[PDB]
Amino acid sequence: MVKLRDWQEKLKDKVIEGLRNNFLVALNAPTGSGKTLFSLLVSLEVKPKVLFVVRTHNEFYPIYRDLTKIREKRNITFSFLVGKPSSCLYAEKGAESEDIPCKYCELKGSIVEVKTDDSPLSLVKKLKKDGLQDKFCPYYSLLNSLYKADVIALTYPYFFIDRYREFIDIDLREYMIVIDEAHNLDKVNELEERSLSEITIQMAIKQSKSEESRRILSKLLNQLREVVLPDEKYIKVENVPKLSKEELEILADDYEDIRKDSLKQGKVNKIHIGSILRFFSLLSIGSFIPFSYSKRLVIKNPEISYYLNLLNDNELSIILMSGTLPPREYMEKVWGIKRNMLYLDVEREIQKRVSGSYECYIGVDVTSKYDMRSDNMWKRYADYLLKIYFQAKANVLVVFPSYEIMDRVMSRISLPKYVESEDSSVEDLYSAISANNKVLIGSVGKGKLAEGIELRNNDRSLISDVVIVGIPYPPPDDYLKILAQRVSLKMNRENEEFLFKIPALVTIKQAIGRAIRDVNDKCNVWLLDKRFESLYWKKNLKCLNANKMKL
């Protein structure tokens, strides 16, 4: 401990004791408020070791830094694991973990002792260089270092996906478990969801080394065109193309050939047929449902509880934290958490905000509701964006309900803009808004755009205005209907909050949090949908003083 913030000082004992009484602790504290140091500090008082489960590798550094300025009368070593398409000496970007043919590698068993005497990401760069020279595998070296460390940091999949959790060699019962940005627990299923697309099959056919393989692929391609639609919503598919045990063996042979060869050229690229094979094997497990989505066949498990049941294990001490945790009742019915839980809200505890503030504007002459959407509505929305852009002190972050709506609106704008997409990366974003001055950033609520980085320059937010076009509600498609039934919740007024409002609120609050972090930050938030004027939204988005506006 070294000078704690007011909230940290007031909750430390409460949390430590709570964890000792076997309660799962849910901590609602804004990102950047010191929850990482807090969790580290309390965890060490509860158990001998600590496991941090985070969204990305970028969250590794603060843990590393906090630990080296923490006080403990004993040695505490830290270690971490980065993905294998990230630590493999012969992996090129785009390579899937399963695509790395470690079997045929002469480094599969060659490891060296690893010491985190430098920032995690820097250490990885060093291991890859020393690994090529000294002849050793960085991945296996890091993997092997885990069980000896006192504090370890891993990404979500290694905790929630069995296939990856098995790779790890730790008891778990001896670790205090800290799950960061826990609002993401709703999307754990995305961690193993498989997809099948026409583009992937063609690339598989182009990368093939077997015509007999290209044969089966060509056929699969035609059948796929009949079970997918462009609709940006999940439509259940009952007639998934079939692949016999024999056809699969033929495809598997082509996969093996490519893998072995790529490792020979020391260049492991994404092997397309691989995702195809993985799609069908997962489809056989039985827990997944196939759906059409944006011209692709996607398989996913609608039951959120499927991945979180591990959180109910009484032999595990757990802290879940985020700036926007859903309410307790939601964690019970939707996440399926049944064990005793202590739910703390940092700001409510210190009776003051620890996050920035904002002026709010509600547009009441627009809406994204189905009954009014038209080309004219999209034009009104584009006009709002221009108006907001012109008066913005800096960059403008726009959150759309879907890629379809973002396109209908953004396509009408000639101002400097950066539109999110599958290729969109962190540096591309940070760059764009660093080569055009004020930029209109187009993003879709379904995340998939940085979120694990701070858009600040010279210690000041790069985002002056956050715009919410319509309400980012999840569509009432087949995926949500099944998710609802798996939890015994009918599609009714009563359950609208749990099924539609809470995830929408999470999306909006996270976007806003992207423009503010410190108590000193200030921004404008434009809620562009007449529906936002209702007290429910003003109360929950904390803008009871919002300004009403038109045009």
- 69 marked as part of a ligand binding site: no
Q: Which is nearer to ligand SF4, 67 or 137 (CB)?
A: 137
- 450 marked as part of a ligand binding site: no
Beta-strand relationship, 357-363 and 522-528: parallel
Q: Whole-number minimum distance, CB 128 to ligand SF4, in Å? A: 9
- 543 marked as part of a ligand binding site: no
Spell out the alpha helix ranges (H) of 47-119. Answer: 60-67, 84-87
Q: Which is nearer to ligand SF4, 139 or 293 (CB)?
A: 139
Say how far apart CA 534 and CA 495 lie, in whole Å.
Answer: 18
Q: Are 63 and 79 in contact (CB under 8 A)?
A: no
Closest C-alpha to 359, from 242, 520, 181, 525 = 525
Q: Whole-number minimum distance, CB 277 to ligand SF4, in Å? A: 19
Say how far apart CA 207 and CA 337 lie, in whole Å.
Answer: 45
- Residue 32 structure tokens: 């950047």
Instruction: Identify the DSSP state of 83.
Output: -
Q: Which is nearer to ligand SF4, 105 or 543 (CB)?
A: 105
Q: Whole-number minimum distance, CB 96 to ligand SF4, in Å? A: 12
Q: Are 405 and 467 in contact (CB under 8 A)?
A: no
- 149 marked as part of a ligand binding site: no
- 105 marked as part of a ligand binding site: yes
Q: Whole-number minimum distance, CB 423 to ligand SF4, in Å? A: 25
- 33 marked as part of a ligand binding site: yes
Point out which residues pair with 178 in neighbouring strands: 52, 319
Residue whose token pair is 């009954």: 371
Q: Are 88 and 99 in contact (CB under 8 A)?
A: no
Which amino acid is it at 365?
D
Q: Whole-number minimum distance, CB 97 to ligand SF4, in Å? A: 9
Q: Whole-number minimum distance, CB 266 to ligand SF4, in Å? A: 9
Q: Are 241 and 296 in contact (CB under 8 A)?
A: no
Instruction: Identify the DSSP state of 265.
Output: T
- Residue 383 structure tokens: 């006009």
Q: Which is nearer to ligand SF4, 85 or 241 (CB)?
A: 85
Q: Where does this chain bind ligand SF4 (CB under 6 A)?
A: 84, 88-90, 100, 102, 105, 107-108, 137, 139-140
Q: Which is nearer to ligand SF4, 88 or 515 (CB)?
A: 88
- 31 marked as part of a ligand binding site: yes
Closest C-alpha to 330, from 189, 446, 495, 492 = 495
Q: Which is nearer to ligand SF4, 135 or 209 (CB)?
A: 135
- 35 marked as part of a ligand binding site: yes
- 523 marked as part of a ligand binding site: no
- 360 marked as part of a ligand binding site: no
Angle at 100 between CA 95 and CA 101, to 5 degrees: 150
Closest C-alpha to 445, from 525, 532, 501, 508 = 508
Q: Which is nearer to ligand SF4, 146 or 444 (CB)?
A: 146
Q: Whole-number minimum distance, CB 162 to ligand SF4, in Å? A: 20
Specify the 3-state DSSP secondary structure of 116. Answer: coil
Q: Whole-number minimum distance, CB 102 to ligand SF4, in Å? A: 3
Q: Which is nearer to ligand SF4, 236 or 267 (CB)?
A: 267
Spell out the alpha helix ranges (H) of 135-234. Answer: 138-145, 157-160, 162-165, 198-207, 211-224
Question: Which residue ranges make up the annotated binding site?
Answer: 29-36, 88, 102, 105, 137
Output the known binding site for ATP.
29-36
Binding-site residue set for [4Fe-4S] cluster: 88, 102, 105, 137
